[PDB]
Amino acid sequence: KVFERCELARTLKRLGMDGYRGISLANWMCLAKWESGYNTRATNYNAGDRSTDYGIFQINSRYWCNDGKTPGAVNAAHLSCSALLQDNIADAVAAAKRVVRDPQGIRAWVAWRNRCQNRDVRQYVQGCGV
């Protein structure tokens, strides 16, 4: 499913993402926008290390979810990567929360540093009623 901007914003708020570990809703919106374009079925294979990024937040199979075919993998979140391709983003949100519980925080995603950090991200939630 491809979410509309405000629809996603409200959903993330309801799920308790606003200010989670110091991360504003506008930042989670900026991350989803650049990682998947707000698309829950987005998948990206990394030929270099044989891992795959799954879902709206492009969560990596080496440390956060299990897909069985990723070398030297771990499952911190303990989820099947299949759960991150659902239309219901409850599991993807639970996984994203786990990722930021680590010292890097939101910085775990390089895409966040390139296009979100130190920028005006208000545009991502403006007019949504959150």
Curated annotation (Swiss-Prot):
Its gene? LYZ
Q: Has UniProt tagged this entry with the keyword Translocase?
A: no
Active-site residues, Swiss-Prot/TrEMBL: E35, D53
What does the entry give for GO biological process?
antimicrobial humoral response; defense response to bacterium; defense response to Gram-negative bacterium; defense response to Gram-positive bacterium; inflammatory response; killing of cells of another organism
Q: Which catalysed reactions does the entry list for this protein?
A: Hydrolysis of (1->4)-beta-linkages between N-acetylmuramic acid and N-acetyl-D-glucosamine residues in a peptidoglycan and between N-acetyl-D-glucosamine residues in chitodextrins
- Compartment annotation: Secreted
The record's annotation in Pfam families points to: Lys (PF00062)
Q: Keyword Secreted, does the record have it?
A: yes
The record makes one more remark, namely: Lysozyme C is capable of both hydrolysis and transglycosylation; it also shows a slight esterase activity. It acts rapidly on both peptide-substituted and unsubstituted peptidoglycan, and slowly on chitin oligosaccharides.
Taxonomically, the superkingdom here is Eukaryota
Involvement in disorder: Amyloidosis, hereditary systemic 5: A form of hereditary systemic amyloidosis, a disorder characterized by amyloid deposition in multiple tissues resulting in a wide clinical spectrum. AMYLD5 primarily affects the viscera, and the predominant clinical features are renal dysfunction of varying severity, and intra-abdominal bleeding. Inheritance is autosomal dominant.
Family membership noted in the UniProt record: Belongs to the glycosyl hydrolase 22 family.
State the oligomer form and interacting partners.
Monomer.
Tell me its EC number(s), please: 3.2.1.17
**Limits of the C-type lysozyme domain:** 1-130
What GO terms fall under cellular component here? azurophil granule lumen; extracellular exosome; extracellular region; extracellular space; specific granule lumen; tertiary granule lumen
Tell me which InterPro entries the record gives. Glyco_hydro_22 (IPR001916), Glyco_hydro_22_CS (IPR019799), Glyco_hydro_22_lys (IPR000974), Lysozyme-like_dom_sf (IPR023346)
Chief location: secreted
Name by which UniProt lists this protein: Lysozyme C
